[PDB]
Amino acid sequence: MRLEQLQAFLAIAETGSFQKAASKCGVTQSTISRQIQSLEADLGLELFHRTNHSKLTLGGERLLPRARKICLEWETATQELGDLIAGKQPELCIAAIHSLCGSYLPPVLQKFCRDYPEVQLRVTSLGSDRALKVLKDGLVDLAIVMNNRFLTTGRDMVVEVLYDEPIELLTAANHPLAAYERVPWSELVRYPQVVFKDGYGMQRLVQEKFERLEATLQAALEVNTLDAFRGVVRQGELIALLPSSALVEARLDPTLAVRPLANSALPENSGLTRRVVMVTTQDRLQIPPIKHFWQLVRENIPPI
Amino acid sequence: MRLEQLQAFLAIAETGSFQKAASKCGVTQSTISRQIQSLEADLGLELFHRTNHSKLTLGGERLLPRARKICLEWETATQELGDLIAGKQPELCIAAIHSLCGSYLPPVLQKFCRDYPEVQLRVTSLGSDRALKVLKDGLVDLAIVMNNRFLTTGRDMVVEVLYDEPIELLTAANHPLAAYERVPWSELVRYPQVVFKDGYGMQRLVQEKFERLEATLQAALEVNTLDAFRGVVRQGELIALLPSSALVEARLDPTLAVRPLALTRRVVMVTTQDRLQIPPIKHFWQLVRENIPP
Amino acid sequence: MRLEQLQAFLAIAETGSFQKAASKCGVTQSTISRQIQSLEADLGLELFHRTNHSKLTLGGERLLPRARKICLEWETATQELGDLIAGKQPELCIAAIHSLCGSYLPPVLQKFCRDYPEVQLRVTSLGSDRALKVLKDGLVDLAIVMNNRFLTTGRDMVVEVLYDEPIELLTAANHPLAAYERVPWSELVRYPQVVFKDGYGMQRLVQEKFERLEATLQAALEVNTLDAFRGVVRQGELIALLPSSALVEARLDPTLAVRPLALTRRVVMVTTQDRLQIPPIKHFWQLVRENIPP
């Protein structure tokens, strides 16, 4: 059934002198006719014209079902290991979190565009406990969550935090933290500071980041939807979590022109700011795409 | 005197994972990977193989047995603690994202973000297929996601049917559609009509129609991110396609703009009868065609 | 050109083992490991991932599908030869007594077996435990047991015991147990005894045949292989039994000298036709009944 006898004797089955198998398939009169003489018995049906002249008796046109289908699999492989990337040409899935999906790295999009412009991309969720689960496996094809987790994968994980912006919060179209321009974290509970997800590491870090400035993280009522982060603050007021790097972008649109600020972050102990963390395996970063770009994106991350 | 250094010790005793996983607790990269030795003193089952990064030694089977049972025993003691403290948890995940809660449902927003820790609602990124599963199965239970192509019921509530989205759209100062007035598709398409979280049911169904005739989304990213997909609008090669729905903005501030599209979008709550005895989520259902929409 | 290495490639696409699954064969230090990369080029979809040792990259889902279907496709073509090759199937599993596999019954049996049901032969022995299970099992198709009753019909099978004797005693060098030929109930052993399966029923039996009048016990060595058996022939230090229809073949066996005690087991089971159901298989039934039933 193997390739040479497969592909050889079959496309033979519509021509011979085995000179036909030598062509197209490759097996010469040598390893084809000799092996096929004994193979003429192994599936159990006469394929060509037993040393006669022209025939289609019981070749492989009816053997390829249990035969070719297989080597058609590696026929797709026979083509090539893909065209873009060897495995999964599109493999650039970004983390879903409420900190920095939107605005801190437009020159990284530049370089990705420079090396490969307008290239289709994808996304996953991680958690941060679940980011851990699915990054020590490396699910999140590009992944960023508090470096204090997700450690396994290939090359000993290579813990790597590109940077750790320091946290502030949403002040507003009327915030009095948009009066009180700083953000310790009491100044949060001063207005309705709803905390994010208990359980989700994202808040494990914020627990510090609201829990050491005259406040303790109050995960009362978070709708777990940015749309709602704005669907009661479009009334003008309500306030919860938007971290530093996009707290370039807290002051935005004409309901709201907002008080920016830096981190109050008494919460630190050792090193403690939430960290943009590209962490990888060589296999994963063994190609121009992620490896150099993923590096550049973890690099060209300006306040812009 | 240890369960913390035991949390990561697990990983250490698990897939070998000492330093890796040790740092994963709130301490140094190689701190728990040192406590293992502290426990090797007294322990007779702890393993610190210097020639078997993965290959185990049986410290697990003997002196883990507690280690998990303790683990959930301290956990669930601290879990019970507080859990029996007026722990009123009236939480019923429903659906309110993408269109509509893009614009005019700030009402249910008013009763799920302005309200206090109660009627807890976990509506996250989910569409009408990802919703048909999550939502139609009712984790999220009923919706405002374009009818899962099958619905209707009326009772514990104020009844109602569906509402809809006109044929127009938001963009930016000149975000492709804002540039090409042709409402016939192939206008913001160059901003590869990015698949706000692709194919939702209100996202698809209008995206389906949008690009079901020569027109094409040919999008770049396929992710669930109002911010980001609409945030990268700042960088400006991507846009949203929810028709004349989430445009309260280009409707508001015309560095986000409205020159139409044309193209079909409608929405009948999954009206899960689970909330046709109950109103967190029957509210979500009755709200809607009565409160969420207005 | 790879229908063999692919068998070891499935282990790397299941538990990610390219050196642990190749340790049974032996090649360099990992071989396949340095071969995964070689194939990484020969395979459009090959996860590489010596990195994901305990996890994965998707080389499986795409370029395994054949890989198993081929696998059983070449395999079951290899099965073909013989599938049509006058492949008569007398092969079976005969649950016989521990000593009903030598020159006691096998002679008469191989002969009557020449008379129609000559299985593709065996050596076989159970312990009157799990054997009744196999008599129900169907994989064996006729068995032996010492306690649980049962039986059925006739011919090829119904109520029948396999020999009877104060359970008897293989005994050899390093063994003054020859004198333990037969005291009242049990004065043979009277020291750390145990039997078959630290578990079986000949086991419980003889342990409790020594204890059936309290030649007493400790669990440290029972009858397992012919050598574990001869260990009980060997010991005098820790001991067991071997019956009468079990003597004709054992007492002629290299060193053993077989020795009951007025210790005592019978054998009773569903040694009926319940696994024979074939006039040929009933031909054993002739020769399970013309051989051991008292």
Add this chain to the structure above:
Amino acid sequence: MRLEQLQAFLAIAETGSFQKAASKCGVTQSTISRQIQSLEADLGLELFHRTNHSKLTLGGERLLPRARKICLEWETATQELGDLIAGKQPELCIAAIHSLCGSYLPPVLQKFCRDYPEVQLRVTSLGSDRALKVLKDGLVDLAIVMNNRFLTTGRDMVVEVLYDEPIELLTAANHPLAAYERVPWSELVRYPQVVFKDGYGMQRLVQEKFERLEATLQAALEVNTLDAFRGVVRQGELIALLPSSALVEARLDPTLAVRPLANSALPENSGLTRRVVMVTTQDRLQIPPIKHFWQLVRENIPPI
């Protein structure tokens, strides 16, 4: 909750003050205040009796759950965890290949097995793929195994010293095996070949013996009871044997012409040297058959 504060008060709850905590838990004197106060409010019940003298208010009576269930776990390690009791004190074994009942059995079966006769360890001809498997899933416990194909079985555990010996063969003048030549490539392997069990340490070793001892391997059947031998090993259907040390006890049969065969395959050589295969490190060590016989396996299993 810590074992200290735990029972310090859990039982002081019947003493009813301080100091006794030290006489109950670790404490030397009465260092339980910083604990009781930290425990008073932390589990959420009145510990002791603030100026309420002797009176059982149940801090521990209902605290033992987890708390003292937990430290009862390490409660069995506070009495012994290194000496005697050791997550099972006694617990060695050997999952043999069954050669050694020639004369070695008694000496290994004594010296210790007659001193601390409790461990239920055998001399049993283990399966082969079932050997590897049980050498992992579980069986007797340890290995006196001849590695002569299963090389690199993970290993990296700890040896003992096990056995070393041919598998020498029963032939017969009462077989025409008289003409059989010293159990070799042609007269140790020829006949309706029969081996021990397929799936067998001694019959991957006796199927080896057909492979390593190059016998046709007809396996017309499978015989470990050796009873098939003499059955048609003087009468003529199969060829197979007991191992050399197992021949020390096998040769005890009559009309069986001695012939040293399985460390004897092809030129009556290249057979089973019982290459010592052993993996078990410290494991549950420190106790009788594991500090006496585990080491004893080394010199005792093969004591002659």
Add this chain to the structure above:
Amino acid sequence: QFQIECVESNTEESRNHYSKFILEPLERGQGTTVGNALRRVLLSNLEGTAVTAVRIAGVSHEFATVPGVREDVLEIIMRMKEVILKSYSSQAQIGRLLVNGPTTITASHFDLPSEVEVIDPTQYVATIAEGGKLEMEFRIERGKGYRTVERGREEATSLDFLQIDSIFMPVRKVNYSVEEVRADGSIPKDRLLLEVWTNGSISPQEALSSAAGILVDLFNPLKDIS
């Protein structure tokens, strides 16, 4: 297989889904047990919704006229029982009604919380003359108790106080019967030919099918562990 054959199915307009149903194989007439059981079971621990109350404001009292009526509270409360309706509301509601002017009452013409529907409108309800007729408000409940009216909303005068003990199991007529078929060799085989009707709120498909459960569970929610 011991089995229903849905058989003749004719809900007609609705009220009495005349529904002769059959369960063919009952070795011995034991089928009757389920028959005579469900006979009460089919309309036993049900949860029919119905009235209790009435808010003839202006006529606090319950025998005086309320003019323009050609039929007074005595016949107004009389014309409640007959109403017909349903909710899930599981909790009370109201309808009111202010027709005026000379008018029947299109039973239909009504005042309508949650499902509360004229399961079949058009009941004659109420005559009247050109004079202002007056409001009629009232509870609505699910229940299974049509035996006691005393101490009703007499528990707390929400309004009018007047409250009647509604009667409510849709099926009012029904006809269970058994017949020993053949197949008596193995064992006298019998079959249960039975009707129900119902008001035309809930057909047996949601009534007989229920009860069916209703005890199957509840008649035997255990093997009488005892």
Add this chain to the structure above:
Amino acid sequence: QFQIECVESNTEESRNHYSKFILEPLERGQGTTVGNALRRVLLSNLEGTAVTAVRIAGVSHEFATVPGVREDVLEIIMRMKEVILKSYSSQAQIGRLLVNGPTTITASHFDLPSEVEVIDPTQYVATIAEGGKLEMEFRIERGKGYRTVERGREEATSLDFLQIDSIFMPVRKVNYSVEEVRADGSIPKDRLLLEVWTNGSISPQEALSSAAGILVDLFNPLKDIS
């Protein structure tokens, strides 16, 4: 919770596990729909091991003596019914018996295939004098065929040929009652009882309590999809 309270449970001469059993709260008579339900169904049918045939052949015939009897077949086949017994054998078996010499028959004294037993031996069975008494062999079956004495083991002659629809019915007197009750706060709920007895083969748990699940299933295998 709608619930059995195992109640007074006897422990002596198993025959009649006198077993007054209760269920306490059954809203109303829905639990009375159980008593009968059982009633019947219980004594509908536990399929029942019972001696059915007889091999004497002292006389082939069935009225002649067989001496030494102080009692012939008409009182020997009669002393069958009363026997009492059980198997799983699900298939026929035999016992024979050759006492002789002047003898009662220790009912016990018997002939005993697979699981077949004098569920209570010692029944008087059979007088006799010193003369050779003769064999008595017979079927055994477990079924609902406790009726119809004709045909059966007749179309198939077997010598010493008689057979008869035995009782196959262990569980005799049985009963119950009921009463309104307190707990009227949660409706005038109410209570039943019962007794059963039984022969002392198959206690109510495996008879009464068994019948409980006999129908719960079968009462309605389907959900009355009708």
